[PDB]
C-alpha cells in the first residue's frame, strides 16, 4: 500500500466560476446565500477530483480571497480599524478597499497573499473555519484532512508595527499565545473525528537560524498529541536534522525544486520513527514526467507515501480542452487535474496494481562573446554622448508605463478589422502624444494601448513560446493570469514594437522611448522547459529582446526602457543562493540591454527598497533607473546615497500611482528636495512612481501637470 496525498488543487473552477461568483457578489448581482451555494459547488468539484485520484482528501482549501487572511481571522488577528468582525462584509474589507491589508508575493511565486497586522500579543479562537469545512464534507459523508498554514509560517508572513516578525526574539512571546489557539482548533477537530491535519510550514525553507529551530521544536512539542502531517516546499529545508527530529509522525518534503533535501536524506537518513511523504510531482511546472523514474526515486527515498512537491494552484485547472496548441505540445503537458492523475498512476504502479521544438542554429548561436554582455563604452563616456544627442533640461520629466485605457479602448480590443484596430491604436497614440506635449513632458511614451500585459504581448510574438485558451492561474482575489508556455528554443522572427514606436516618434520632435520587458520577467511569468538550464532560456530571450533593441536604434529611437520586475521577484527564497542567481540575471539583462553608446537605456523597477539588492543593481548596464519614491517621501534614496561611487541617473517617482488623489506641487517638492541632499542635481529625473493603467484620465492629467510645474520651479 502506497498512501497518496495532494494539495493546493485550484479553486477557481474550469470556467472561472470562482471569479464570476466573487465579482457578482461584490457587484451585488447575487445574494450572499447564492455566493455560498456557488462556493459549495466548487468545494464538491475539488473534493471529487481528489477522491478520484488520491487517498487523503484536503479540506479548508476554498478561501474566499486568501488563505493567509483566513489564518489571521481564525486566530483573531483583525486590526482594530475594521471594528467588530461581522463576517464576509469585514472579510472583504480586509481584502480590498481603502482599509485593506497589504498585498505581497507569497514566497517566490505568482500568488499574492494578504499580510496580517499583529496589533495585540493575545490571539484567541475567533472562528474555526477548519472545523466548519471539516463538518461540511462529513455531512456529505466525506472524510477530509484540514489544510492549515502552520503557526511558524503564519507569523513569518506577518508584521508588527510595520516590520516583519522573523527574528526569534520577535516570535518567541507571540508563538506561545499563537500555539494555544492552534491547540484549541486541533482539539475540536479530533473530537469530531478528524484523523489527519495538514500543516504547511514552507517558511522552514528560508535561510533560518539555529535559534529558529529551537523555537520550532518547542512549538511542535506542544502539538505532539495531534495527528499532524507537516509539509514544506519551494526549496529544501534549512536544517534537515533539526526538522526530522521534530515530534511529528509524518513529514512531507519537496524533492522536486531542489537537490539538497535528497542529499541530506542520503547522508543522514530518515528516522524509522516517522513516515516520509515524498513530494515528487511538480506543482509549478506543466510537464509530463517519466513516472518510471519518479517511481525509482520513491523507492530510493524509502517512503511509502507520495504527493505533489508544492501547491498545485500554481498550475491551470486542466489540459483537457487545450486543442489549439502548437503541434506536439499538448502531449507533453499536464495541468493540475492531470497532475492528480499522475499521482494515481504512480500509486498503482508502486502497489503493483499496474529534442522537441529545438532550434539548433539559435541554441548554438546563443551558446557561442563576452562583449555581448558588455556595452562598448563605460557610462561616463555614454552619458556625454547621450546628453549631447538629447539636449535635455535640468530635472527632465517623463512617465514610465502604460496610460489609462478607457472603455472604448478596452472594448475596441475585444471587438473587428485588423486595419480598423491598427487604425484605432494610432488614433489613440496620436492623441497621447498631443496630451503630453500640452502638459509639458520632456520624454514621451506611446501609451501602450495595444498591450494588455507586459509579458503576453511579447510571448505571442516570440517563437518557441505558446499561449493557452483556458490556462488561467489565480494571481490574487479574483484576478487570474494566463501564463505563456516556453516549450522550445526562443527566437524573434520579426520586429515587435517598431510600428507603434516609429509612428509615435513621427508625430513629435521630442524623444519617444521604446518600451520593452526584460528576459527574466518574460521567463518568470511563464512556464518553461526543465530540460535546459534557466540561464540558457533567459539568454535566448535576451538575445531576442536585443535584436528588437537594435531595430529601434536603426529606426532612430534614442531611448529604450526595459522593465525587469522579476529581477528581484524571481530571486531564490534563500538569500544564500542569491549569488548564483544574480550572476545570470545580471548577464541576461545586460545582454538584452547591450545597445550602442548613443542609446539611453532606462531600467524600471517598482521595488519599495533597494538596500538588499543595490550591489546587484549596480552591475546592470542601464544609463538611468526609475524608482518609486513617493511612499517613503524619497527616503528610499538612502540605498543610493550610501553606495560609494554611484553616478547614474535616477527617475524619482514623486506620485503614488495607486492613489486617485492628485498630489500637491508642495508634496512632490519635498520628495525631490530629499533626494538631492547628497546626489548631484544632474542625475535626477522627475516622474510618477509606476504604471498609470489603473488610474483615470481626470486624475492623471492634473497630476502630470503638477509634476511638470514642480519641474520648472526646481530650475
Ligand atoms: C504575473 N503578474 C505579475 C505582475 N506584476 C509583477 N510584478 N509580478 C507578477 O508576477 N503583473 C501581472 C500579474 C499579476 N497581476 C495581475 C493584475 C491584474 C490581472 C487581471 O485583471 N486579470 C484579468 C484578465 C485581464 C486580461 O488579460 O484581459 C482577470 O480576468 O483576472 C491579472 C494579474
Ligand atoms: O524568504 C522568503 C520571504 O522573503 C518572503 O518572500 C516569503 O513570502
Author numbering: 0 to 353, 363 to 376, 378 to 424, 430 to 729
Which statements did the authors publish about this structure?
Structures of CH3-H4folate bound to MetE from T. maritima have been determined in both the reduced (zinc-replete) enzyme and the oxidized (disulfide-bonded) form. CH3-H4folate is bound in identical fashion in both structures. The folate substrate binds in a deep cleft between the two barrels, with its glutamate tail accommodated by a groove in the enzyme surface. Folate is bound by conserved residues in the N-terminal barrel (aqua) and the C-terminal barrel (yellow) with the N5-CH3 facing away from the zinc, at a distance of almost 14 Å. Arg15, Lys18, Arg493, and Arg496 interact with the first glutamyl residue, which is the only one of the three γ-linked glutamate residues that is ordered in the binary complex. In the binary complex with CH3-H4folate, the DMV loop is also recruited to the position it occupies when Hcy is bound. The changes that are induced by binding of folate are reproduced in the complex of folate with the oxidized enzyme. The orientation of bound folate in the binary complexes does not allow transfer of the methyl group to Hcy. As can be seen in Figure 5, the N5-methyl carbon faces away from zinc and Hcy; it is 11 Å from the sulfur of Hcy when the binary complexes are superimposed.
